[PDB]
Design a protein around this nucleic acid. Sequence first.
DNA 1: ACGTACGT
DNA 2: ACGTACGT
Lengths: 8, 8
Amino acid sequence: XAXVXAXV
Amino acid sequence: XAXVXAXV
DNA sequence: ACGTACGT
DNA sequence: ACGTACGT
Ligand SMILES: *C(=O)c1cnc2ccccc2n1
Ligand SMILES: *C(=O)c1cnc2ccccc2n1
Ligand SMILES: *C(=O)c1cnc2ccccc2n1
Ligand SMILES: *C(=O)c1cnc2ccccc2n1
Ligand SMILES: [Mg+2]
Ligand SMILES: [Mg+2]
């Protein structure tokens, strides 16, 4: 759920 | 030389 | 001359 | 329910 490298 | 994850 | 960064 | 981010 977090987006720091994928954002899902 | 750049540091964006290792910085060497 | 190498690896850091998050939760829904 | 998954991967992005740089050059000395
Ligand atoms: C986001 O909160 C989140 C949490 N756990 C995960 C596990 C695997 C892929 C995506 C994820 N996203
Ligand atoms: C993004 O590509 C990415 C990859 N691995 C991680 C690990 C822990 C926190 C954040 C991350 N983001
Ligand atoms: C920094 O400018 C730089 C450039 N190329 C590299 C290759 C391998 C490890 C470290 C590096 N750092
Ligand atoms: C840092 O851990 C890291 C890893 N791979 C990269 C690829 C391209 C640009 C920056 C990067 N930084
Ligand atoms: Mg460490
Ligand atoms: Mg891409």
